[PDB]
Amino acid sequence: CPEGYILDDGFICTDIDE
């Protein structure tokens, strides 16, 4: 996951949509 798409909850690819 690139910039903006970070790791949340328990270190998982989180969404964003720009």
| Dist CA 16 CA 11 (whole Å) | 15
User: 7 Cβ partners below 8 Å, 6+ apart?
Assistant: 1, 13, 14
Residue whose tokens read 């690819």: 13
Spell out where the chain has E strands: 7-8, 12-13
Q: Which residues pair with 13 in a beta bridge?
A: 7
Q: Which residues lie closer than 8 Å to 18 by C-beta, 6 or more apart?
A: 4
CA 13 to CA 4: how far, in whole Å? 10
Residues 6+ apart with CB under 8 A from 13: 1, 5, 7
